[PDB]
Amino acid sequence: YLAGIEAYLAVMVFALVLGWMNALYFTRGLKLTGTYSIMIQKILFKDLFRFLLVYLLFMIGYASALVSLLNPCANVPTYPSCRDSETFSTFLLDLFKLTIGMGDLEMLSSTKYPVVFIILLVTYIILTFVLLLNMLIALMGETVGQVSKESKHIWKLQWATTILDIERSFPVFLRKA
Amino acid sequence: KTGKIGIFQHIIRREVTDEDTRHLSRKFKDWAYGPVYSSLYDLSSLDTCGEEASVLEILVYNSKIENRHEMLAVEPINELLRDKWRKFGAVSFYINVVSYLCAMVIFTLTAYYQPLEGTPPYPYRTTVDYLRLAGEVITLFTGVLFFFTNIKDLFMKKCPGVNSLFIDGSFQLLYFIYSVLVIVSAALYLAGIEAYLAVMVFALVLGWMNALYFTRGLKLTGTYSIMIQKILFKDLFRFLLVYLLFMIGYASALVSLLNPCANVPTYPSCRDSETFSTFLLDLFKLTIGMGDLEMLSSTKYPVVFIILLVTYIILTFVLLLNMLIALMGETVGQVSKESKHIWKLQWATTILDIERSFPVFLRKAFRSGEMVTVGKSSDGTPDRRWCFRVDEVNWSHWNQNLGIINEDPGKNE
Amino acid sequence: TGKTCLPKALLNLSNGRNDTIPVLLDIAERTGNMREFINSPFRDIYYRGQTALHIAIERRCKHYVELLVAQGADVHAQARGRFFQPKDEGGYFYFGELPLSLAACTNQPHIVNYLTENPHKKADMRRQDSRGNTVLHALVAIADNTRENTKFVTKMYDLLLLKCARLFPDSNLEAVLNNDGLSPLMMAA
Ligand SMILES: CCCCCC/C=C/CCCCCCCC(=O)O[C@H](COC(=O)CCCCCCCCCCC/C=C\CCCCCCCC)COP(=O)(O)OCC[N+](C)(C)C
Ligand SMILES: CCCCCC/C=C\CCCCCCCC(=O)O[C@H](COC(=O)CCCCCCCCCCC/C=C/CCCCCCCC)COP(=O)(O)OCC[N+](C)(C)C
Ligand SMILES: CCCCCC/C=C\CCCCCCCC(=O)O[C@H](COC(=O)CCCCCCCCCCC/C=C/CCCCCCCC)COP(=O)(O)OCC[N+](C)(C)C
Ligand SMILES: CCCCCC/C=C\CCCCCCCC(=O)O[C@H](COC(=O)CCCCCCCCCCC/C=C\CCCCCCCC)COP(=O)(O)OCC[N+](C)(C)C
Ligand SMILES: CCCCCC/C=C\CCCCCCCC(=O)O[C@H](COC(=O)CCCCCCCCCCC/C=C\CCCCCCCC)COP(=O)(O)OCC[N+](C)(C)C
Ligand SMILES: CCCCCC/C=C\CCCCCCCC(=O)O[C@H](COC(=O)CCCCCCCCCCC/C=C\CCCCCCCC)COP(=O)(O)OCC[N+](C)(C)C
Ligand SMILES: CCCCCC/C=C\CCCCCCCC(=O)O[C@H](COC(=O)CCCCCCCCCCC/C=C\CCCCCCCC)COP(=O)(O)OCC[N+](C)(C)C
Ligand SMILES: CCCCCC/C=C\CCCCCCCC(=O)O[C@H](COC(=O)CCCCCCCCCCC/C=C\CCCCCCCC)COP(=O)(O)OCC[N+](C)(C)C
Ligand code: NA
Ligand code: NA
Ligand code: NA
């Protein structure tokens, strides 16, 4: 913003979202919310990274498989029927929308083999929304029942580390008061 | 081979004290300074690099799966496999993974740059099309490679209760499929038929789903890829059964209410000749949530139509697909302990396969052990056994003065 | 190493009795050496400082600890070897470095009394090893949070700082810091 480059914003926009997500730091003053912000961080480890791994295998697999069926636009200007140069990119997003539910199949006749296309989408929808994203819910239940006792113990350290940091920041005559 | 733990344990930790029969021992006490001692196991039959038949290849390949995890979770076996993983089992496995992922990148790029005009697009005539040909030749190698390796397995290790066997029983089956489709697609791409693609497209998706094979190098992801396979059995096939009964029932019931197009050209109001087909998909979308009711007045009885959709939506999204979530929770709490035990077999089977693929001089270079003069064999002949140390601590068993081979405690390096 | 007759006897101990140690020290006297023979430490980089007395207690033989001390051998020799080093450097068993700290860290009370209350040269509890760690610093080191370990750690812990008060009536031994700046309580934490 002082060197003249105009991408001060984009970097600034990531900072903004961290900082509000760094307000979860201050959930230590209550066992409720402090136990909450550490399960979020445990269900983000022994949980939704394992999911991101396989989900990127199922997704690259199908996204490469289904765009392989769409015919190029050299064949001609219209993308949403055809394939050219950003097909993969937009098509991953349409597959990311499908697993979570806020998409529409938008079934396509432009492909060369149309029936095999829908055999693959329905397997994506079964093996990602009905099988994985619901198993993703079930693994959390196996987590939050196990890391609950740990989570009450980690908060007691968080909470204690908070106090001794405040105390340590005082002068000695004020600590001694 | 028969799954007898209680005696299998007792043999491997056989401490005999009377020196006339100490040679009938397999746990020794190399040294003991105070409350810390080093126990020294006999790997005479367990870890034989090549030449002899081994206890460890028997537990891991041809044994009873109901007790392998308890037979591999005893004295040195578990320590012995970790001692193989850090040497070569880790590394070579993580070369197997990158080589496979690349091969699937290489198989990805061809299909994306595979043309779609005319006869099967033989003519290359450019550099990029020769780069693609490098991807198809490297590909077909992978197919025939996974073909031969699985057929020699059919003459050798193979055929447990396949695909209900979470120790590479299923993946052997799937790499074999992937091996076929790359041979079929290459046959039709060379026979002139233009459906090389459709077969090739199923191969691509298997192979990325066959990269779940390589989730064994971590307890996290390996425990993950076997729950997927258990929640696909004691879970979402039961669902597919009833869900196909509720669905055929309603799909036949609701299309029975729509009036034919002989009555006239417009489907989305009317019924003709693909009504059922498209209408199943609209009902598949409803249960999962990414559909719209798209309520229809074209039917002859419109009110009874919505009485049935709302029962589909209650008995499939609110009742079954949410019960489907709840049964998983009953699964993943029960098959977690099994899943940590199956990984230990997967992980072990991975090591012994890599080890078995080495020549004997290289296995004999990555030996897990050491020659030790453990005693005299009553002829003056010193017993030079290849053994394995285990430091151990006990603040209660103070009289450790039985079999102290090395009077000088420490390993004195 | 530097091993001698007198260690070799105690390593090769027959049911708590090797009849040679009363003999060799008689012959050691008639040529003449007791404060050079018994004391002779292993000059290795791995058993450094270890003596016959460090061996007489780890074998759990009380009868000769009286004998080795009867001639006034040593009760503050420091076993600084890489073996006598914690399990954070490349060692196995850190008891401190002293024979008193050894007997306390091996659940052997009677010598811990003896090396304090004997006729001859006494082992005081204030003596620091090469890291400042006294006997109580050491009991915090060998301790684990099991059941049988915490039993005799607390007993031999108690036994000494009570015994430090009936002996030198001054600063408690638990106040004695070390060469990191810590006390036995701050060392346990
Ligand atoms: C010594 C302890 C080391 C401890 C520290 C950690 C060291 C790690 C090194 C890891 C080496 C292994 C990785 C190399 C690539 C590899 O092994 O790739 C393998 C196969 O590769 C080969 O066949 C190539 C033959 C040469 C390989 C060894 C080269 C390294 C040698 C140097 C290491 C040091 C020791 C000896 C050198 C010789 C001199 C005598 C030493 C003593 C002193 C002189 C991939 O598996 P794949 O078959 O695809 O999977 C099986 C398939 N299935 C059965 C599951 C279906
Ligand atoms: C270790 C921390 C350090 C980070 C290193 C990166 C730092 C700096 C990179 C910025 C320089 C690059 C841009 C310069 C060129 C440029 O100008 O490029 C622009 C476009 O560039 C961009 O958009 C740059 C996007 C930057 C974001 C990077 C990631 C930031 C950090 C990410 C991590 C934090 C995540 C948080 C998210 C929350 C979720 C997770 C929370 C955690 C889990 C809960 C071109 O367009 P134009 O308009 O023409 O530009 C003007 C040019 N002109 C015409 C004036 C010459
Ligand atoms: C045991 C393995 C062996 C499999 C056996 C099947 C092998 C080969 C069949 C291929 C020949 C048939 C086509 C020839 C006729 C033809 O050409 O037919 C086409 C259309 O035909 C097709 O599209 C055929 C679809 C093939 C897919 C079959 C299933 C493949 C295997 C399925 C299993 C694996 C699943 C994986 C999915 C992942 C999820 C689950 C993972 C597991 C759970 C996690 C007609 O159109 P046209 O353009 O005119 O064609 C050109 C004709 N012309 C004009 C040149 C004369
Ligand atoms: C250890 C593995 C390392 C391997 C990394 C290799 C990755 C990339 C290098 C190769 C890409 C080079 C760029 C391609 C050429 C290009 O520029 O293509 C552009 C298009 O954009 C692309 O194609 C790039 C998107 C991706 C493409 C598929 C590859 C997918 C890569 C996925 C990597 C997966 C990693 C990991 C798996 C996931 C799990 C986690 C891992 C395990 C645990 C940590 C130009 O298109 P256009 O000209 O319009 O073509 C039209 C052609 N028409 C119409 C004439 C026929
Ligand atoms: C294990 C998962 C993977 C299984 C894959 C193996 C099964 C099938 C793949 C092969 C299908 C090949 C279809 C034919 C080739 C093709 O595409 O031909 C097209 C047209 O096709 C058709 O007319 C085929 C009629 C519809 C029936 C489809 C198959 C059966 C459907 C039911 C599948 C059920 C199982 C599975 C689905 C549920 C999965 C969830 C489970 C859990 C997953 C883990 C070529 O156009 P053209 O003839 O030129 O156009 C028409 C003629 N006109 C008028 C233009 C001249
Ligand atoms: C310190 C160690 C020193 C050694 C260094 C490495 C030395 C040599 C490397 C040799 C590479 C090739 C080895 C192949 C091993 C093999 O045959 O692997 C197979 C996997 O299938 C293949 O490979 C396909 C065959 C075609 C080759 C791959 C594609 C073409 C070559 C690509 C190489 C480029 C790499 C990487 C470039 C990108 C780099 C990103 C780094 C990033 C680091 C983080 C093992 O399957 P299997 O075990 O049998 O399990 C299968 C399942 N079943 C049957 C047991 C049930
Ligand atoms: C052990 C049981 C074995 C029984 C299998 C019998 C199956 C099929 C044989 C009969 C079908 C013959 C073809 C029909 C005629 C035809 O060609 O009809 C076509 C249309 O397409 C169809 O009708 C075929 C789609 C399905 C139709 C309903 C049957 C549903 C079958 C479901 C099977 C369920 C299995 C299992 C239950 C699920 C649970 C798992 C099991 C238990 C555990 C493993 C022509 O229509 P169009 O000319 O347009 O007519 C218009 C008429 N208009 C407008 C003039 C009035
Ligand atoms: C156990 C589950 C199954 C229960 C089924 C039994 C209950 C009802 C079925 C019978 C309904 C018959 C309706 C009348 C016939 C018909 O359809 O007449 C049509 C029109 O209709 C009407 O005007 C009926 C008014 C609306 C009230 C509907 C019923 C009551 C609704 C509430 C239902 C609540 C219970 C259940 C629903 C919730 C279920 C979730 C629980 C859990 C499941 C497991 C004929 O057109 P026309 O008169 O010519 O057109 C109007 C006249 N004009 C202007 C054109 C001349
Ligand atoms: Na739940
Ligand atoms: Na939804
Ligand atoms: Na929705």
Numbering used by the authors:
A (entry chain A): 567 to 641, 654 to 755
B (entry chain D): 379 to 641, 654 to 803
C (entry chain A): 190 to 378
List passages from the publication reporting this PDB structure.
Transient receptor potential (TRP) channel TRPV4 is a polymodal cellular sensor that responds to moderate heat, cell swelling, shear stress, and small-molecule ligands. Transient receptor potential (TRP) channel TRPV4 is a non-selective cation channel that is ubiquitously expressed in most tissues, including bone, skin, vasculature, heart, brain, lungs, liver, kidneys, and bladder. The channel is activated by warm temperatures (>27 °C), an increase of cell volume, endogenous ligands such as derivatives of arachidonic acid, and synthetic compounds. The cytoskeletal remodeling GTPase RhoA has been shown to suppress TRPV4 activity.
